[PDB]
Amino acid sequence: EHDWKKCDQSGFCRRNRAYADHALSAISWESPYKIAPETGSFKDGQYQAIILKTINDHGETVRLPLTVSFLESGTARVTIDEEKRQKGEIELRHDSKARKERYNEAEQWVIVGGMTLDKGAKVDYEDKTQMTVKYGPSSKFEATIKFAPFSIDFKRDGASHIKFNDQGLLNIEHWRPKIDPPDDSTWWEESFGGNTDSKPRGPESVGLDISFVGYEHVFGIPSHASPLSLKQTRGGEGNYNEPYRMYNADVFEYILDSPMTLYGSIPFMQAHRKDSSVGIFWLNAAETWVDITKGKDSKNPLALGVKSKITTRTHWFSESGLLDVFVFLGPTPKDIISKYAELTGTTAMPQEFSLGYHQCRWNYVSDEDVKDVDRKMDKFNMPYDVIWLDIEYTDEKKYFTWDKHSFKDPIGMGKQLEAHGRKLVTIIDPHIKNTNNYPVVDELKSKDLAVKTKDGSIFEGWCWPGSSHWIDAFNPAAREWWKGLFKYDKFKGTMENTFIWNAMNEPSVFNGPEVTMPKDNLHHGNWEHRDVHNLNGMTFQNATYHALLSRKPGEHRRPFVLTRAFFAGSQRLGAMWTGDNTADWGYLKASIPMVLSQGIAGFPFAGADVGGFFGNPDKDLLTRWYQTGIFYPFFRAHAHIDARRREPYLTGEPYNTIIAAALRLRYSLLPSWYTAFRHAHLDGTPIIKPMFYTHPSEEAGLPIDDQFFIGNTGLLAKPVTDKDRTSVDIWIPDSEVYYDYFTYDIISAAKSKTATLDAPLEKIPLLMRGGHVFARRDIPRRSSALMKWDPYTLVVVLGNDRKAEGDLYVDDGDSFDYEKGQYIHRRFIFDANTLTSADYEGRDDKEGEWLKKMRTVNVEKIIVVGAPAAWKGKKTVTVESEGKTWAAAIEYNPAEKSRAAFAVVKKVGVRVGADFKIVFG
Ligand SMILES: OC[C@H]1O[C@H](O[C@@H]2[C@@H](O)[C@@H](O)O[C@H](CO)[C@H]2O)[C@H](O)[C@@H](O)[C@@H]1O
């Protein structure tokens, strides 16, 4: 039975909430923080200065240095530190060796670019009340710094969009000694969950109010079982009462519709309205809470006599470290997320197989179980790419071992899978069993690679194996060590098709407070665990990522690693999933806003356990779950140890047939999924896209989180996620023509609206937007690897303009050769009765081995949906490619009831890597 801190039980949460209550209550609250104007200098894209915080009635002050940066991107950055702790002029309690300064290495872990300062940014106006800086593209952005009381105001297009400290909630808890008097009851030791945090530094939280001016919707800060449009947190009907929490934790049977923390945290929030978008990124690795309220601008937000325009007020606070925030002014969603990704990284190029279907449970119990499941999937014509081994494969929960009784020949199991280009994934968690005759633990201790307690002893606690120690992946040497442990000749029973799953990396500690480590544990650098908690997961995933780059000499290849816990930047390192969900309809429905929130926070490679993890889903739920799951960028079935076997072939008819069809759709679209990952790699474009992203001009889109577009395809999905539903209402975003993917029925033309669509169990509700081209592979195979050289079908979807565009990206799916241009990237354009293929980047024609072999690979088929009538009774198209011209057969099919006119060209016979031109009509 799990115990979680509510705000009031977290000391620094209580104090910041109470500081907010006081400020909103008080008459003429002023933030007791001022820039000393004469400390101010602007140079070379950067203001620096000293804020003075007034700490008492007597006017005594402390010095907090302020750094405001204006980046070339047109992002700004605001940092506040504490001068006394920069200089070491404090004393820790208990003779702690913990670092005196404010944690300042989050940047190091997270930021990989976009830091170049804009020398074209400049002071427009100054005096000794305030200064305004102009920055970003042709100086369209303004920041007005106010000195007294400190505030910042971020503007563009003649208005404030984001304000810092307008409510006067700035709070840097300055260091103080523990002294009896000449409410401090949460300042020092705090007890929770069987543990007492010694709290050697005392109070050190950082907080700020950030207002989004004229914005009614905000989004991000995953992961939460919450809508995509975030709720208010200060009570009221359909609101929460607690702030949103980010404190990566192992939350057994986490509930729906809640601001409680889950397993990963990305403190990035965006605000969206019609044709305007902004956002912020709160770069802090400590426990972080976010309150959100919405109302009028007046101090009483329900007052009469004022403008009705809504502002969203947010109140951010973290336990320790710097106050460090980035500000994005957009003005589109695409802009914001694109800039965020320049800072924190784009999605890594994935292993192509990892977009396939993954089959998992706790546990497959032998190598015979695995090999039998493999054969059963082929027998029932259910394609999949990966079979997964959970923790029972180990020798008594020791990582880098196998149970010999149960897994006799892991190499042989390996090789059966390799017969179909399939892969094996095996779990490795960060806890190392504290036992005898275990070289891994000996090396961990002796090399000093383990996480430590508050007095420098090696931390010990309980997880799967019993007593355990934890690798300290913040330590570069622990990462270098770890890399060694995964070589094929070192990690026996693994081979080239073996990849890795990290869980329990929050870290999960069974006997620990909130199932994690004490706050006063110590890491490499002597940082407290409180400083770095939300980075821990990602440190561990990073270590594992780099271990898979090269596992034998001459190997250099893309890792695939699934993580449970994560942070900003984890997108560079692999996939995630939403942890231990439950086999129930509510969880299926909730999966979609969660997965969407992931990608709009820059970490799109995301999914939830298909079927739900806890319990036994009914057969219709499981079937629906496959129909949703084929639209997760990470698509894996998984099941708890007490759950019945539910490998998909066990479901029974008619469900087997329906689930097989879902799988085949996923596989057929694999070329378009892969292309969407490509874009995610190139500029952080989400893989599936909410309406607010694709249609920033459509106000009615803002709260919608149960449908989405796929990549660049124009495919609009809305899976059924309610019990016994046999139809679905799809919001049509705009006036373009939308076609049923299966029948080509015209659903809407001409007008935005809600359209009703037949949706029985056997139906996947999926629409094709006019204006788009996308590629698929129609030939069914048993895995993605066996699709590698099959021909493509292009679908050209036309509206009234009879124009479209789309794209296709391909490469070997495995190497870093894409970095030297070993790839095919096609842009397809439909215009004036002509489909053309050109290089996406406009490269001229040096061919490696994969590219050479692609010469045998063709577009063989083109389907045109919404074909124009003037094609009626024309029997050929003209095809040109690589100097050669020919005719190919086309059949035109006239419209018929609500079904569209379409046309089909078979046997196109043009190689996918070359320019081409096809003239219709
Ligand atoms: O490795 C086995 C599973 O571990 C994790 O799940 C846990 C869950 O199964 C349950 O037993 O409770 C503990 C404590 O909260 C959880 O950590 C993974 O999330 C799961 O995917 C694995 O199958």
Author numbering: 33 to 214, 236 to 898, 902 to 977
In the authors' words:
Glucosidase I removes the outermost α1,2-linked glucose from the D1 branch, and then glucosidase II (GII) trims second and third α1,3-linked glucose residues by catalyzing hydrolyses at the Glc-α1,3-Glc and Glc-α1,3-Man glycosidic linkages. Here we performed an X-ray crystallographic study of GIIα to elucidate its substrate recognition mechanism. The overall structure of GIIα is composed of four major domains and three subdomains: N-terminal domain (residues 31–384), subdomain B1 (residues 207–256), β8α8 barrel domain (residues 385–737), subdomain B2 (residues 484–526), subdomain B3 (residues 559–581), proximal C-terminal domain (residues 738–823), and distal C-terminal domain (residues 824–977). Taken together, our structural data revealed that GIIα can recognize two kinds of glucosylated substrates, Glc-α1,3-Glc and Glc-α1,3-Man, via a bilocular substrate-binding pocket with a tolerant +1 subsite.
